[PDB]
Amino acid sequence: ENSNQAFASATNDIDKNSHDRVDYLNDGDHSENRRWTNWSPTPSSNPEVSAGVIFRENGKIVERTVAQAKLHFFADSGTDAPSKLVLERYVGPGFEVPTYYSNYQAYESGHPFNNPENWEAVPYRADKDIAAGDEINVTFKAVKAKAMRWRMERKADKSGVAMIEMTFLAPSE
Ligand SMILES: [Ca+2]
């Protein structure tokens, strides 16, 4: 499509039996049955997974100013909200949307998204506990970026992170 593009370091969308999709992160829909997850039957010992949005309009990547975010997590037997949550803004070189935008780590490791030095932490405040259920609202000092992400860690007793929606928004006003 020609609008914002959701992306993730990893996604459970490889197995033909899976219905998880990274594109469900920014579709406006809050159905529990349309989620992104990085669930695996054999999870990595590194609990980290990142998911984010590349800002686009009329098919071209654009810079936006953002100061607010929304997060909607999901949980079930395998997945949950994360134990740790870092907001980051892209500060790397110019880029295009990854071909493997749901699995850049495994399938497009040369993409600049895969280099941690291309992401800068953004301090933030959330309105409630980081848990599955209600939408969580987040504020931060306004930054300019072409892409934002959340660098997350799964819980130790879970096999992945699950999300129903992720949004970034312009400052108040
Ligand atoms: Ca959604």
Author numbering: 1826 to 1998
What do the authors report?
Subsequently, this approach was expanded to the relevant galactose-containing sugars LacNAc, lactose, galactopyranosyl-β-1,3-N-acetyl-D-glucosamine (lacto-N-biose), and galactopyranosyl-β-1,3-N-acetyl-D-galactosamine [Thomsen-Freidenreich (TF) epitope] and binding was only observed to LacNAc and lactose. Significantly, the CBMs only bound with significant affinity to sugars that are substrates for the catalytic domain.
The N-terminal region of BgaA comprising amino acid residues 138–993 has amino acid sequence identity with GH family 2 enzymes. Through detailed structural and functional analyses the molecular basis for the catalytic specificity of BgaA is defined and this activity is demonstrated as critical for the ability of pneumococci to utilize complex N-linked glycans as a carbon source and protect the bacterium from opsonophagocytic killing. Further analyses also revealed the presence of non-catalytic CBMs within the C-terminal region of BgaA that mediate adherence to host cell surface LacNAc and/or lactose.
